[PDB]
């Protein structure tokens, strides 16, 4: 035990890799699982993803819709349970960023009623949902 020639991995951790075209007995000899002839049997034989043989594809016979909002890319959603990572009792955008629950380039945050909290927090400048506000006040915090 505990020698360089007495260490082994757990069962099922390692498998042999598949080797094609090495005889009848291996079961993947000759054609190597590619079947007989055709486009897919050639080297680099697959067709482009989304190609359906020539008919108008699924992503082209359907219409485009919608537009992308720019403010959504900078609005951040925060779970209530994530407040436990905040050091101190003041919950603000800066302290959430310091706790790494909000990415540094975000300009605003919203707190949703997802988990549970026990500490009493003071929330300054962050939007709260109706459930999250009740949860904070029940736990003993206040808003601004």
């Amino acid at each position: 035990t505990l020698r360089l020639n007495e260490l082994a991995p757990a069962e099922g951790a390692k498998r042999e890799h598949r080797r094609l075209g090495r005889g009848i007995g291996s079961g993947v000899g000759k054609t190597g699982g590619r079947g007989i002839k055709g486009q897919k049997s050639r080297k680099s034989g697959g067709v482009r993803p989304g190609f359906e043989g020539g008919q108008t594809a699924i992503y082209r016979r359907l219409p485009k819709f919608g537009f992308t909002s720019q403010i959504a890319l900078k609005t951040a959603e925060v779970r209530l349970s994530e407040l436990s990572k905040v050091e101190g009792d003041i919950v603000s955008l800066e302290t959430l960023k310091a706790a790494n629950v909000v990415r540094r380039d975000q300009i605003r945050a919203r707190i949703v009623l997802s988990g549970e909290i026990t500490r009493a927090f003071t929330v300054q400048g962050v939007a709260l949902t109706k459930g999250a506000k009740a949860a904070i006040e029940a736990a003993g915090g206040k808003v601004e």
């Binding site: 035990t1 505990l2 360089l4 260490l7 991995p9 757990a10 951790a13």
Partner: protein
């Protein structure tokens, strides 16, 4: 946990660093990762594009009765390119911080319970003499051993340099392969305390 040094003194060492249950799969993964990270991986071959010459078509496509050929450096031909030419490779693996620490803790605990770890209050040599170090180790009955000290004295390092099956390392420079390879590990109490603080 309570351990006994060679002189009968009692030492208190944390169970986290020196008493973890042995996890062979974790230890094996970390050890093989260390061995793989030891590789150099310097080599290459020449593909059909790299071999000298071979730009022109050797003979015409039809009419000669030969098998059709495109270049004399084809990988089918003797002296042609290698089909899949190798390039230098990087053999390092990622090891999770917690996985490395847990493997080292398991190794240390297993050494303790197999009685291959020997604790000493102090381990120093007066002069850089190979014979001095040899006699000192023969007294402790650890002629083949890895010595771990809090700091590596120059005299000790010089005395140990020429001895086969003996190496001396700092407490902060232990590695899983060397902990397993040597027959015994002779550790000073200060080095043991430093390793305790590091928790493996």
């Amino acid at each position: 946990m309570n351990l006994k040094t060679v002189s009968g003194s009692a030492v208190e060492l944390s169970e986290v660093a020196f008493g973890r249950e042995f996890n062979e799969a974790l230890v094996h993964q970390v050890v093989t990762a260390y061995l793989a990270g030891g590789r150099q991986g310097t080599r290459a071959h020449k593909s059909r594009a790299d071999v000298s010459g071979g730009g022109k078509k050797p003979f015409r496509q039809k009419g000669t009765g030969r098998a059709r050929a495109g270049s004399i450096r084809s990988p089918i031909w003797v002296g042609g390119g290698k089909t899949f030419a190798a390039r230098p490779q990087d053999w390092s693996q990622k090891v999770n911080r917690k996985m490395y620490r847990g493997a080292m803790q398991c190794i240390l605990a297993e050494l303790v319970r197999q009685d291959r770890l020997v604790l000493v209050e102090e381990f120093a040599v007066a002069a850089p003499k190979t014979k001095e170090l040899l006699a000192k180790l023969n007294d402790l009955n650890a002629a083949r051993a890895l010595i771990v000290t809090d700091a590596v004295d120059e005299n000790l390092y010089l005395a140990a340099r020429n001895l086969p099956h003996v190496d001396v390392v700092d407490a902060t420079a232990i590695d899983p392969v060397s902990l397993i390879a040597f027959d015994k590990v002779v550790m000073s109490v200060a080095a043991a305390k430093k390793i305790e603080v590091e928790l493996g």
